[PDB]
Amino acid sequence: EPNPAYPLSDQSNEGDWVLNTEMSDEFELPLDEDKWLIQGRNNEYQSRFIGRAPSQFSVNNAYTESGKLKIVTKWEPDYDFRLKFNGDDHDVVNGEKIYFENITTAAVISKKQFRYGYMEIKCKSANAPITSSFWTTGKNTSEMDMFEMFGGHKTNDSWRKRLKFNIISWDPNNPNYFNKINGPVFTQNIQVGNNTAGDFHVYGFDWTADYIKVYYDGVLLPEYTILKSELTNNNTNPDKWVTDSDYWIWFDSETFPWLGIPKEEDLPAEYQIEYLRVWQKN
Ligand SMILES: O=S(=O)(O)O[C@@H]1[C@H](O[C@H]2O[C@@H]3CO[C@@H]([C@H]3O)[C@H]2O)[C@@H](O)[C@H](O[C@@H]2[C@@H]3OC[C@H]2O[C@H](O[C@@H]2[C@@H](O)[C@H](O[C@@H]4[C@@H]5OC[C@H]4O[C@H](O[C@@H]4[C@@H](O)[C@H](O)O[C@H](CO)[C@@H]4O)[C@@H]5O)O[C@H](CO)[C@@H]2OS(=O)(=O)O)[C@@H]3O)O[C@@H]1CO
């Protein structure tokens, strides 16, 4: 059996790793809401993000069970869907009003932040046309989407094995700012050999000032390594490196309406997180 004190990919502890306890959770107890924000709890919304239409985050769809954090996607047409903070009952996406209806998901966000570390999540994505995501934000700095999975994609088997990885700039001073370029600074489709919804797997993201590396079930996936020297072209384009920020960690599920929408028969579905281990260098 592997030693849980160290990253599955670094069992000899070459990294001299120490668990960051305020960012980590084995989810063996009821969810600690002094450690984790259930999005919407007491009307608190990280990033003022109530959900991606048609879905909305529900405080009842996040809880621990059987040793796992559960992010639950439900068909709940009678849910009391709220307005966005801007007053709208819809998102506007590619010219279309997409109304909030039918589906509730959840988002769980760390109440603490950290900068740099080995992030290891053991999880099974929701088996429906819904995302299961593991990501970060910092306040008007940037966002790393370690993965967006879509475990129950009905028509694209590649998506069933995909971790969509993104880096997004939230800094209006940055030429790669999301509301300037309307897209990520960097994106790649991490493809693993097994359906993300089929079983639990261990995903590792080693985040440093100079690189980000991806690990699957303890093994480096070198095809997906991100180097600061490459993204910035040897520091000639430094604004392309935006991940030197303190981050909150998010787990959530969302409808991506243009990718797919679940049927009632697909639901409920669960994005199950057996644990999150975040280590930092001693
Ligand atoms: O339009 S204005 O220029 O006027 O600006 C308005 C507003 O001004 C107005 O407010 C009043 C209404 O009219 C008057 C006012 O009476 C105007 O002055 C500004 O105040 C407002 O300012 C915001 C706040 O400070 C900057 C603004 O945005 C900040 O929040 C950011 C969040 O919007 C952003 O949220 C995203 C969101 O949840 C996390 C973010 O990503 C998520 O999507 C991800 C996706 O990117 C990824 O690929 O996949 C993920 C998983 O699937 C997920 O889908 C959601 O889209 O997060 C940012 C992080 O830095 C900021 O959040 S925060 O950390 O700073 O809290 C502040 O709310 O801006 C208005 C115009 O927007």
From TrEMBL:
Q: Which GO terms describe its molecular function?
A: hydrolase activity, hydrolyzing O-glycosyl compounds
Q: Where is the GH16 domain?
A: 1-282
Spell out the Gene3D superfamilies in the cross-references.
Answer: 2.60.120.200
Query: What superkingdom heads the lineage?
Result: Bacteria
Q: Which GO terms describe its biological process?
A: carbohydrate metabolic process
Q: Which SUPFAM superfamilies does this chain map to?
A: Concanavalin A-like lectins/glucanases (SSF49899)
Q: Name the protein family.
A: Belongs to the glycosyl hydrolase 16 family.
The protein depicted here goes by the name GH16 domain-containing protein
Please report the organism this UniProt entry assigns to the protein.
Answer: Wenyingzhuangia fucanilytica
Q: What is the lineage of its organism?
A: Bacteria, Pseudomonadati, Bacteroidota, Flavobacteriia, Flavobacteriales
